[PDB]
Amino acid sequence: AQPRETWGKKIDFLLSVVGFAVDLANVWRFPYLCYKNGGGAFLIPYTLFLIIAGMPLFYMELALGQYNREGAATVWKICPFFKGVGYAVILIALYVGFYYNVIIAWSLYYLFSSFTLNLPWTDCGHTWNSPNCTDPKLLNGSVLGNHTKYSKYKFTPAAEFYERGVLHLHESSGIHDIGLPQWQLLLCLMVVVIVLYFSLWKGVKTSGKVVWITATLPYFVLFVLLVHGVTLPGASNGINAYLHIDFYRLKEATVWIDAATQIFFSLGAGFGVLIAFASYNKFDNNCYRDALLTSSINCITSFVSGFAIFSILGYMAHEHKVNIEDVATEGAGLVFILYPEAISTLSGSTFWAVVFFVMLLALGLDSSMGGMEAVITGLADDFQVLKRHRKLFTFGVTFSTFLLALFCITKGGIYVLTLLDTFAAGTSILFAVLMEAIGVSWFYGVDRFSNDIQQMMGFRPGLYWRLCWKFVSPAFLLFVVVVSIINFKPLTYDDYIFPPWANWVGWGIALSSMVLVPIYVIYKFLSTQGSLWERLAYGITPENEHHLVAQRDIRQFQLQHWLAI
Amino acid sequence: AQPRETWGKKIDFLLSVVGFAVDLANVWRFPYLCYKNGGGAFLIPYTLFLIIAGMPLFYMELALGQYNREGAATVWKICPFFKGVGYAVILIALYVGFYYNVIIAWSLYYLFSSFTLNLPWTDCGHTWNSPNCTDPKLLNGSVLGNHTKYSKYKFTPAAEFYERGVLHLHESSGIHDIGLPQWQLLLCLMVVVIVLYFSLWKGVKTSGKVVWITATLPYFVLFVLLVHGVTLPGASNGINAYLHIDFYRLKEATVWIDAATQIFFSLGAGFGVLIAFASYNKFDNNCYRDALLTSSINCITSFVSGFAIFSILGYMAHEHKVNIEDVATEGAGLVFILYPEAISTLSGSTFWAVVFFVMLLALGLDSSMGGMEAVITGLADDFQVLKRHRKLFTFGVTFSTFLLALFCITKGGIYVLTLLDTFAAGTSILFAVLMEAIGVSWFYGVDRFSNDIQQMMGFRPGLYWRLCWKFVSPAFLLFVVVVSIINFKPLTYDDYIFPPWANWVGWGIALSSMVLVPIYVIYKFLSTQGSLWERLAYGITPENEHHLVAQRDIRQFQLQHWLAI
Ligand SMILES: CN1Cc2c(N)cccc2[C@H](c2ccccc2)C1
Numbered sequence A, B: 001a002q003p004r005e006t007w008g009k010k011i012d013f014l015l016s017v018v019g020f021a022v023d024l025a026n027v028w029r030f031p032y033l034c035y036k037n038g039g040g041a042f043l044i045p046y047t048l049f050l051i052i053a054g055m056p057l058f059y060m061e062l063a064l065g066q067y068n069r070e071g072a073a074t075v076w077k078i079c080p081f082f083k084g085v086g087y088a089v090i091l092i093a094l095y096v097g098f099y100y101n102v103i104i105a106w107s108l109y110y111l112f113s114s115f116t117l118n119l120p121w122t123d124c125g126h127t128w129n130s131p132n133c134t135d136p137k138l139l140n141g142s143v144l145g146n147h148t149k150y151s152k153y154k155f156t157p158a159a160e161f162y163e164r165g166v167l168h169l170h171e172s173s174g175i176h177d178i179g180l181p182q183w184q185l186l187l188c189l190m191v192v193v194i195v196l197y198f199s200l201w202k203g204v205k206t207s208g209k210v211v212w213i214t215a216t217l218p219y220f221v222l223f224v225l226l227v228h229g230v231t232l233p234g235a236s237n238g239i240n241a242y243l244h245i246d247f248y249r250l251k252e253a254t255v256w257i258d259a260a261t262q263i264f265f266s267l268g269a270g271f272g273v274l275i276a277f278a279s280y281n282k283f284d285n286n287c288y289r290d291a292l293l294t295s296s297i298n299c300i301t302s303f304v305s306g307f308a309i310f311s312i313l314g315y316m317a318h319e320h321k322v323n324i325e326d327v328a329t330e331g332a333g334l335v336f337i338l339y340p341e342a343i344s345t346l347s348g349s350t351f352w353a354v355v356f357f358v359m360l361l362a363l364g365l366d367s368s369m370g371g372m373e374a375v376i377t378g379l380a381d382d383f384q385v386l387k388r389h390r391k392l393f394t395f396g397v398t399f400s401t402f403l404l405a406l407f408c409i410t411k412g413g414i415y416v417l418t419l420l421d422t423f424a425a426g427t428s429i430l431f432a433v434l435m436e437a438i439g440v441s442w443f444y445g446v447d448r449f450s451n452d453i454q455q456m457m458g459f460r461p462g463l464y465w466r467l468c469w470k471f472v473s474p475a476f477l478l479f480v481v482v483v484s485i486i487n488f489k490p491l492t493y494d495d496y497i498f499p500p501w502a503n504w505v506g507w508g509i510a511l512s513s514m515v516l517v518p519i520y521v522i523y524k525f526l527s528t529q530g531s532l533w534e535r536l537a538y539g540i541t542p543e544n545e546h547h548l549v550a551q552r553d554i555r556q557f558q559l560q561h562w563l564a565i
């Protein structure tokens, strides 16, 4: 009943997409995974794979969002047998909303604690840094250590602080006894959801202004951190270890599939955020150059974050008289346990720590805003009533996210966080992108998509894009699923071992999504009236062209549609 | 858009109201509380108080439900400043839906376990009766005991079975570590919610047929149990101890307020079930005689259940060579721990146990059906859309009840059950009935209510009913509220002591209801347009007569309305 909330400037759309793509996984996971699989020789399988897993699919979604001007759920009007895939992604970006706002609360506790001349992670004592009875010592200032991994050593002050204070993992023993939510984490999550609501209460009108600071400050932070790190003793060793080209790392499962998963999870394709952001652009906008630029900027950001992180790791290895392979870390530990440990060593640690934690806050906040905006836009385009009462809908979404995140802020919330992240994110987003690629390239057809893009922009996509859409991307989005299913390992923490029922609950969530897609399939199949072929023709044809089912001219049954390149 | 679902026969309405009024509190709580406060001399303060707390208020609600043909929420169109009270009760009957379906799962586990020639509660051994290492012995068959209360002795087989098997309280240590829900209790609760949905999916059309067996079988069960118990050694001692008139029990807080609360909680006024059941009757139905008959039948049922329970207690005291005061018990323990212990002693324990547990199932099932029907009818009359999709609404209500009852079926679910029951039921229903009485007798006026009843039935209520409506029932309710607030004790189990934060959460739920009523008050005050008096006149006048605010003729501001008797 009103024109759609088009972006005021395309710069806002670009900044939003970049802030969604750039994530903490580019900071903590990209450098370690790059150094593990041959160092610099990790880039050769990366970019090529990146190209596929980065260029068509993203473009496709963008093009989809540009052509089918709707949310993630109701974007499948061209093929009604895949709207469940539009539902699952909305649930996906919801499951990634429960635990990823707890990681933002972790960057706010550290920010509040950094407003002190003496940082708690510097040394031992009752600056909170809740200590264990088992010899809370100094890293290297007073006593040394031998034959131990500095990454997982939990007896340093910067490693005791994080766990014991923020997570209170000592008070818990596993997911069987989660305990009670931390009141400090509760207040941090309240502040997080409050700023999320205040940034997403009035639509993309506010988010396009917030992404100006949220998507540009981390770049300046990383630049200043690199400038400071390059002028540090021992950082050159870590930098040389980072870009150490080992071309003899030809093992497939170790390098290739890992790089593919890294690119696919870093770029963010499969949460509905891309379709939601592209549904707010003008019909004449060029989404091809936008997708290419966003992918290149994401890769450059990951590369410079890896440079900074490995310079810090080399500085730590030189200052602690240890090798660089030991300080190599990935995950929340590298950004919360090990990086503040290095920040505390340099002079003026307050400014560096405050800036680093504000950057960490912004990186998570942009991705959370993108995910919540995608969910809200999808559920509003699915049911138009919620589109009118956007304030109450956003408030309800944020409150449900806050209430369902209490299990991730409790004494044993890190276990639930890891379970949700791994199982939900991996399996759900893999199945979702596989179904999306199949539906767009086989049921709707690559020829129709190319014609839609030609209607959008004057230039038609080349043969390479269609070949990657139809035969390459669906082949590299099913191989990864088979590898993840076959090479699945039981859920394991640093030392804690998850009982079988936790893994069964994770696989139950995965299967819930992967049946909810066929649940909507069979729902659309049964909710129709007619014969078998008549029912099948109302789910593989465009809805706006459903009258063609009455005229009985269906091309999906024809061989030319399946053989169209 | 359609005629309301009027009851097919008034017999169905009577059976539904009787099955809602008759509850497990009449079975386990009424006899013990009657014997405690002077025995038979407990009846003299009872009935008189009963009369007030039984006759007008109930009648009022019924009359209200007969005049204002709507649910519990939207019954305050005569005074829009009290619809929040119609909301709170819907929440009340919801908070009593979470834990009271777990008590029904407790009567289904015992029913399934009773389908065996050798009952597990008869003796010790690995017939499940999960035993503790601390000397699992026989009650009196092998060894004796001295200076111990048989009610709370948890080392008998019938006392170890209930806790360790059904609740698994040994695996828990309090509300701080609730644990995981029991899969057997999970299946029992699934069966319970399934039969509740299948009985309430098509409205009162099915419930009126279900109450035929649900509200009449417990009476035959109690009759057969009395006939069996009177012909038992030592039952005469317990029967004489039951009706032992001690007229010197003149202490007020011990007898009077306890009997008042007993009547008020046993009759069920304050859950919205009465208004919901009266909104489905014909406009010419006589709700006065119906209310009187239902109250009298409830009292007679409580009396005969007390007779049967105390005959069983006397039999146990004679068979165990102990006094009758020791076996006196109230709550779930008397019906689950002590009564099956007596059933196992007699020959043919299988039939008696099966019949007793089917009666226990029906007693809880009728009350749960009444509460859920009240909630559904209220929320459907509040929002008419949910009235059309009644199947999906009932399914969602039952599923939310099942999901929010997992905290009451876990290893420490009995603590959450007691917390919810005590705090929510007591405080919320007290404040709700107080606000209802005040709004009906002071804002709407007893004269208007009497005129509405005269329009309903030919006879106008006498002066006694109006005097009890205006000055006696509200004052008695306020006195009970003040006593409950002042004489409040910290939450305590048999031996476990609740931490302060559990009591704070209970009082937080209580205060949530007792602000949600003023929340709707201030919402209606602010959502109006006009001056102060103009805004106030749109919340204390009938909605259908709101045009009188334009004509500026308001009687609530006049003194004749407040002085009307
Ligand atoms: C782009 N995203 C990638 C990703 C992956 N692959 C796994 C877990 C979290 C995330 C981040 C995210 C934040 C909020 C909602 C959805 C996703 C960013």
Ligand SMILES: CN1Cc2c(N)cccc2[C@H](c2ccccc2)C1
Residues within 6 Å of the ligand: B020, B021, B023, B025, B093, B096, B097, B100, B264, B265, B266, B267, B268, B269, B271, B367, B368, B370, B371, B372, B421, B425
């Ligand atoms: C009449 N009711 C009285 C009562 C009280 N006073 C306290 C707790 C439970 C109950 C029972 C009930 C069952 C389901 C919904 C609401 C109430 C029956």
Ligand SMILES: [Cl-]
Residues within 6 Å of the ligand: A026, A030, A262, A263, A264, A265, A266, A267, A302
């Ligand atoms: Cl990446």
Ligand SMILES: [Cl-]
Residues within 6 Å of the ligand: B026, B030, B262, B263, B264, B266, B267, B298, B299, B302
């Ligand atoms: Cl009673």
Ligand code: NA
Residues within 6 Å of the ligand: A018, A019, A020, A021, A022, A023, A214, A215, A362, A363, A364, A366, A367
């Ligand atoms: Na970002």
Ligand code: NA
Residues within 6 Å of the ligand: B018, B019, B020, B021, B022, B023, B215, B362, B363, B364, B366, B367
């Ligand atoms: Na009943």
